[PDB]
Each structure stands twice: as structure tokens, then as C-alpha cells.
Design a protein around this motif. Structure first.
Motif, PDB file in Angstrom:
ATOM      1  N   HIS B  38       0.833  -1.193   0.000  1.00  0.00           N
ATOM      2  CA  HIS B  38       0.000   0.000   0.000  1.00  0.00           C
ATOM      3  C   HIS B  38       0.871   1.248   0.000  1.00  0.00           C
ATOM      4  O   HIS B  38       1.876   1.314   0.709  1.00  0.00           O
ATOM      5  CB  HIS B  38      -0.934   0.003   1.212  1.00  0.00           C
ATOM      6  N   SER B  40       0.600   4.973   1.041  1.00  0.00           N
ATOM      7  CA  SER B  40      -0.221   5.886   1.851  1.00  0.00           C
ATOM      8  C   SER B  40      -0.317   7.314   1.296  1.00  0.00           C
ATOM      9  O   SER B  40      -1.176   8.090   1.724  1.00  0.00           O
ATOM     10  CB  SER B  40       0.257   5.900   3.305  1.00  0.00           C
ATOM     11  N   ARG B  45      -2.767   0.252  -4.021  1.00  0.00           N
ATOM     12  CA  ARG B  45      -2.497  -1.035  -3.388  1.00  0.00           C
ATOM     13  C   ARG B  45      -2.388  -2.164  -4.407  1.00  0.00           C
ATOM     14  O   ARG B  45      -2.954  -2.090  -5.501  1.00  0.00           O
ATOM     15  CB  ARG B  45      -3.534  -1.361  -2.296  1.00  0.00           C
ATOM     16  N   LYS B  55      -9.009  -0.955   4.880  1.00  0.00           N
ATOM     17  CA  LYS B  55      -7.662  -1.500   4.616  1.00  0.00           C
ATOM     18  C   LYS B  55      -7.670  -2.918   4.013  1.00  0.00           C
ATOM     19  O   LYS B  55      -7.093  -3.842   4.595  1.00  0.00           O
ATOM     20  CB  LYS B  55      -6.796  -1.461   5.886  1.00  0.00           C
ATOM     21  N   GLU B  58      -4.525  -5.116   3.754  1.00  0.00           N
ATOM     22  CA  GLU B  58      -4.064  -5.677   5.020  1.00  0.00           C
ATOM     23  C   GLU B  58      -4.881  -6.914   5.390  1.00  0.00           C
ATOM     24  O   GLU B  58      -4.319  -7.935   5.796  1.00  0.00           O
ATOM     25  CB  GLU B  58      -4.119  -4.624   6.130  1.00  0.00           C
TER      26      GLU B  58
END
Lengths: 85, 85
Positions: B38, B40, B45, B55, B58
Motif C-alpha cells: 500500500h 499511503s 495497493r 484497509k 491488510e
């Protein structure tokens, strides 16, 4: 201000274990000269610098050309990474 | 919650550069299977998981046994570190 690596491990680490972890990481970048260490849980530092005044272990390291800070849980290690150049 | 390594470099890094840095660190611990990444800063992603929901990169990694998160500046890399055991 220098390059920083912060390691957060689930397990508890001793000073020796944390130093080994830090030295292992440092070694990918060159010859890791360990200048100072601080334990944020106990207040311990090496070398023996006390009362002089704000974060003296960091000041000591920075005055000796520290260029990489590696934290392993409660421990902070200040290295001068030397390269062949 | 897994073991975490957060790298903060003074220089700006590309995705390729950050991935190389992360893979290099991961390699000290075993066979680093990169599961997700990812950015930020941009919201990028991999793999391509969008709208599903909080997310998702994740969640994807954790469902595949991710056990080490390595951040390099704005990038987060989720690895399954495999060992010979």
C-alpha cells in the motif's frame, strides 16, 4: 536527524537480543559501528554519560557521525554506518 | 497484530526502491513472501482490491498468514516469512 528503523516485536527482548537484532539490520547497509544505546524502560545508556543533559547518548553519537538509528522495542541503537566508498 | 519494522529514510523512494529495501530487510528472517503493498501517499495497493472495505490490502495479507509488516516511508509491505522449521 538521520535515517531511522523502528522495530516492534511481539516478544520481549533483552539488551543482548535487541543489539543482535539491530546489528543484523545495520549490516545490510555497511560496517555498523555501534556508538550508543539507550533503554527507554530503565533509563540505562552506554557509554556512561549522565547529567549532561538532554538525551546525552544521542548527542554523543551524533558528534561521532551517527547516521542510522535503530530501535528494537524499548531499546535505541545509534550507529555510524561505514562504507568502502 | 504482527511484528513490525518501520523505516524512515531522509531521501524520497519509488515503489521499486521501497520494495527492494523491504525485501532486503525481510530476507534476514527467512523466505519473504510478499502478499500486499500500500502507498499511503497515493492510495495505491496491490493486489487490486478496492471497495471492500477498511484497509483491504491488510485484510487480504492477514488472511494469507502475514506475520511481518515492513513500512518504508509512505509504503507498507505485508510479508509471510516462511522458515525451514
Amino acid at each position: 536527524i538521520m535515517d531511522e528503523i523502528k522495530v516492534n516485536l511481539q516478544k520481549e527482548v533483552s539488551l543482548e537480543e535487541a543489539e543482535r537484532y539491530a546489528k543484523n539490520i545495520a549490516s545490510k547497509y555497511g560496517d555498523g559501528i555501534l556508538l550508543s544505546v539507550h533503554d527507554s524502560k530503565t533509563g540505562y545508556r552506554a557509554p556512561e554519560v549522565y547529567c549532561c543533559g538532554e538525551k546525552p547518548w544521542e548527542v554523543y553519537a551524533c558528534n561521532r557521525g551517527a547516521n542510522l538509528k535503530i530501535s528494537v522495542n524499548q531499546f535505541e541503537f545509534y550507529f555510524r554506518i561505514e562504507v568502502e566508498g
